[PDB]
């Protein structure tokens, strides 16, 4: 079973970096082959992929974020870590940490899922 | 990015009413599909992957068949246990994308 | 009979620049084919495709391969090596087989009936003048195994010969191993032999810091001029020549001493499913060298980096040395279940797989023509190429037989490890014919010699580690089934030095 | 001083040296196409084994070649090397997509690599390789 | 043959007595296939690696001799608008050579700042900075950051010398001479795009560079220079040059950028072209299918070929402006290490020689600050160099 868990911030002033990390118990992300995904949810509205992670450190971004995100990978402390640039307003929803792959979905579907993280920008 | 569209936005069925909903991708995406569940405010949880075959969590119940153009998740035997938004995600193509949300009560 | 032919050695010894790595395991041999030599061919099997035919024979002699690095070293000793040393090749091999015991099963009703068989023998020989074929090389299962409380079962030996579809041809050989002198032991006879490994060149365990294009300096300007500018605007008649001087304000056009090493361009295949093609390119697709009217896929081929730095995602087709996770099934599995290796390190020095070596002009260029040119997808050597070798893992093979010819070039092998003219070798081992089978220790010896690193960089090494998260059972150690699983694939290459 | 001539034909070829009763520990791609989800792209590995000879991993490939045109009217090293009127072999020359087939392309001559084996049949100069006379 | 070569060397001060990080970022950027990351140092290197050096207008170095002695301290102070030069006795200067070649090795790229033709002139030391790994302008975690500052170094106030003996190890004599079944054929190449010294014939379309052949390495397009030996062109055309495939200098005084083909002395190897191709020709066909009643043959162009049993071939011709020896990359393997600009490819060539100006410190302050003192006295220094060669000839 693998348990995921988002911790930061909970509040960032507008144009300040977000940072927020997740914390994979369960597995290790370097030996799972699995690849590690994010995903936002703007209050009362649909998701929107953000990127993924995949375990050798790869990475591929959203292009309708404007190459803010950036996603780090620390596989010693088996954590990877979203961070996005020149917060706005607009870019506040609940951050969703989740695994991206299975044996035959891998980096498609998303079956196990974080916790969810608040985060408001704000002035 | 590939547009998803759910029929129905907010389908108002009650217990023990046979429910389906359906989302028709912009483009052909091949069989390649994601429902969702989200109960409120927890993260969402995947129920059928691929086209038709079931996650190993999830109820009997669930099912859908995508023709790849047009996909339909039929909730069959509605218990109240469930009554949620549901979400489809494309795999075909970069950047993945979940439309909109069906609400069901 | 009532006395220990033999002690049990299982240890390693670091000193000064050698390393001393002892194993020793416990094994168990069957009786094969009913002491009978069998012939084999597809045709018993089913012969589906010419390119997979095969003529060749069954024996019942078992031998024994310790040819796979996880034999002799412990994860940690590895650990040890990659990360302390730049080389190493071992230089004396001392082997040890005894504590024989044959046993004898007669089967009545349900219950099998086992005791010992006290004057029973067991024949066992080494092939040191290679007269019979050389098995070793092919990465075979079998070996001895990772974990010493494993108990194995010696593989069988086979072999094949010339053939045309499943028929036979004048020139193939047929080899008697009974033929050969073999000594017997009983059950309180041990066997032992030494070996002196042949000069063979330090595996190279660093990764180059520099790549083979940046090694100018940035801060000068070359003496060199190249040509800018073949116009200087759009209209008529406006071809001219414009020489510039090459320097760190555009380095892509210096001239260059070296240049990289040959290149056989793979098919790329992505590990996210849906980037790859909707359609069946296994087979099809893939790069493959024709032998004899028999096509055969280029597996691991010439050495070459896996991909270009910063997408991980791909990997060659047939480009990369594939082992598998513990209970991989032997057949269609996932992505998941194989650890799919990936030459990161070697992308410095030598081509990508997945990439063209470059282009050529085509054609003469004139008024009416223009410059034409086209891809490389394959280049053999030329004067001037500086390449790497493939890296070995912990799991992979150690050394393989040049195959005694007339030429060769580079004999050192496409798996990894050392080319050998004469490899450790075989051990070749059977029950004498009297239901029998025999068990016993088998302890191999092999001495490693080391090259340290004396490099003065000033920042520190990556090295290799072992992650502190709280896992529920530790890597490389046994489940609570007793297990032990091995769960990812170690380099050599972590150490730094100039190119 | 020259090396001795070899008089001899290979009993074996070279793509056969594996020993036929045992599995490699090593993978390949099989199968890259569900076909029962109606050709859902999928990715399936297998071992490398007696039953599929063709896939196994070799450590050496055979020499050069240089090809010639089969005229209708060297047998004996067809062990390791190349027919003279067939191909080297394929290559790839695109990667493959989603919205583009993968392609493959003959070779018609083949250089030297490391790891080639190969049977044969001096100007005063920089360099040579492999000096024997053709 | 001993040729013996004495210079004089002037020594400025680099970075101020400090080391930058440089990558093409605090230079601008250019594209991906420029890009670069490495650091620079204070220390200027003697770079001789010039046949010029040696000589006033087969072959192989067998021994070496380095002389560095009458070392001249100055020191420049502005007093308001003039500048006043007094020689400060109890400086010291540092020189130490990299024999283990644990530094990365710059000589073989055959950069300006060599010691001069010309008997009379005086030179600038250049300064030594070097290349790692990188990822666009970005560092990955396996570049290395070397300081020389941690090599032991031989301190020279003005009476102290500097002197060392180097060994050639053994290398080849350099050659500068000149349907039937047949026993050998003739060296690899890789073609390269044919551009005449006619304005004319070369067509309107820019053609330098998408043109040129290049390799691919880790998915940067580097051009082919000089690239593999070839013949430059056919007998009987002399104003056809290989696009990428010959050493071109520039004459006395030319300019940096955008020069005409005037000011450039243009080589040739058409010397070789006996036993090579020519760089802007195939290698030949090769045959494309089988004939039949049904298909006709057909044929095809080499436009590249490697190394193949029974190939000969001349390495390239060396030139009194070029280099002499390159360092051969410490790898796995190679083949004929040769280097493509000519001379001689060694394992262990003639070591790099370091130098550079201890730095003084101007007054420091009569309160304790822990930081680095970044005030300096302004300071140079100048000398001898006298470098030996005993040459072998056939």
């Known amino acids: ?123 | 990015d590939i547009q998803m569209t759910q029929s129905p936005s907010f389908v108002s069925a009650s217990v023990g009413d046979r429910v389906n909903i359906t989302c028709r991708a912009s483009q052909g995406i091949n069989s390649w599909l994601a429902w969702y569940q989200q109960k409120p405010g927890k993260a969402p949880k995947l129920l059928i992957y691929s086209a038709s075959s079931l996650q190993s969590g999830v109820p009997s119940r669930f099912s859908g068949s995508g023709s790849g153009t047009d996909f339909t998740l039929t909730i069959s035997t509605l218990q109240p246990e469930d009554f949620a938004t549901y979400y489809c995600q494309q795999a075909n193509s970069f950047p993945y994308t979940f439309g909109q949300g069906t609400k069901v009560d | 009979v009532g006395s220990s032919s033999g002690n049990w050695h299982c240890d390693s010894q670091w000193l000064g620049d050698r390393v001393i790595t002892t194993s020793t395991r416990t094994w168990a041999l069957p009786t094969y084919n009913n002491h009978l030599y069998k012939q084999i061919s597809n045709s018993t099997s089913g012969g589906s495709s010419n390119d997979n035919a095969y003529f060749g024979y069954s024996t019942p002699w078992g031998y024994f391969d310790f040819n796979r690095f996880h034999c002799h070293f412990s994860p940690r000793d590895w650990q040890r090596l990659i990360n302390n040393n730049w080389g190493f090749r071992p230089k004396r091999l001392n082997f040890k087989l005894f504590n024989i015991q044959v046993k004898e099963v007669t089967d009545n009703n349900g219950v099998k009936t086992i005791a010992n068989n006290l004057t029973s023998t067991v024949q066992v020989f080494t092939d040191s003048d290679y007269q019979l074929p050389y098995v070793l090389g092919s990465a075979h299962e079998g070996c001895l195994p990772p974990f010493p409380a494993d108990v194995f079962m010696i593989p069988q030996y086979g072999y094949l010969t010339l053939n045309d579809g499943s028929q036979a041809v004048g020139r193939s050989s047929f080899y008697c191993l009974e033929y050969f002198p073999s000594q017997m032991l009983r059950t309180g006879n041990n066997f032992q032999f030494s070996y002196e490994f042949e000069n063979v060149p330090f595996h190279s365990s660093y990764a180059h810091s520099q790549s083979l294009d940046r090694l100018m300096n940035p801060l000068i300007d070359q003496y060199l001029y190249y040509l800018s500018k073949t116009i200087n605007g759009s209209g008529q008649n406006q071809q001219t020549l414009k020489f510039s001087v090459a320097g760190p304000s555009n380095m892509a056009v210096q001239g260059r001493n070296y240049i990289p090493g040959p290149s056989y361009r793979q098919q790329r295949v992505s590990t996210t499913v849906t980037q790859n093609n909707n359609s069946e390119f296994a087979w099809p697709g893939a790069s493959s060298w024709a032998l004899n009217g028999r096509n055969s896929l280029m597996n691991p081929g010439p050495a070459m980096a896996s991909h270009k730095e910063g997408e991980d995602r791909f990997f060659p087709l047939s480009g990369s040395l594939i082992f598998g996770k513990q209970g991989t099934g032997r057949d269609n599995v996932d992505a998941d279940k194989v650890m799919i290796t990936n030459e990161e390190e070697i992308k410095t020095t030598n081509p990508v797989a997945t990439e063209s070596y470059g282009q050529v002009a085509t054609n003469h260029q004139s008024a009416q023509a223009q410059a034409q040119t086209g891809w490389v997808q394959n280049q053999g050597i030329l004067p001037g190429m500086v390449w790497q070798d493939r890296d070995v893992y912990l799991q992979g093979p150690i050394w393989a037989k040049i195959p005694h010819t007339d030429g060769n070039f580079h004999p050192s092998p496409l798996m990894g490890g050392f080319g050998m003219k004469h490899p450790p070798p075989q051990i070749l081992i059977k029950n004498t014919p009297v239901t029998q089978y025999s068990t016993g220790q088998v302890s191999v010896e092999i001495e490693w010699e080391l090259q340290k690193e004396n490099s003065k960089r000033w920042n520190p090494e990556i090295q290799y580690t072992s992650n502190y998260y709280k896992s529920n059972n530790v890597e490389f150690a046994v489940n609570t089934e007793g297990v032990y699983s091995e769960p990812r694939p170690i380099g050599t290459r972590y150490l730094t030095r100039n190119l």
């Open chain 1, 1 to 123: 079973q693998v348990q995921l868990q988002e911790s930061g911030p909970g509040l960032v002033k507008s144009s300040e970096t977000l940072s927020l990390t997740c914390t994979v118990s369960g597995e290790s992300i370097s030996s799972s082959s699995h690849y590690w995904g994010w995903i936002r949810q703007p209050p009362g509205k649909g998701l929107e992929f953000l990127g993924n992670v995949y375990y050798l450190g790869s990475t591929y971004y959203n292009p309708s974020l404007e190459s803010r995100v950036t996603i780090l990978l620390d596989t010693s402390k088996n954590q990877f870590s979203l961070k996005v640039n020149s917060v706005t307003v607009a870019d506040t929803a609940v951050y969703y940490c989740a695994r991206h792959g299975a044996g035959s979905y891998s980096g498609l579907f998303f079956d196990y899922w974080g916790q969810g993280a608040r985060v408001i920008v704000s002035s």
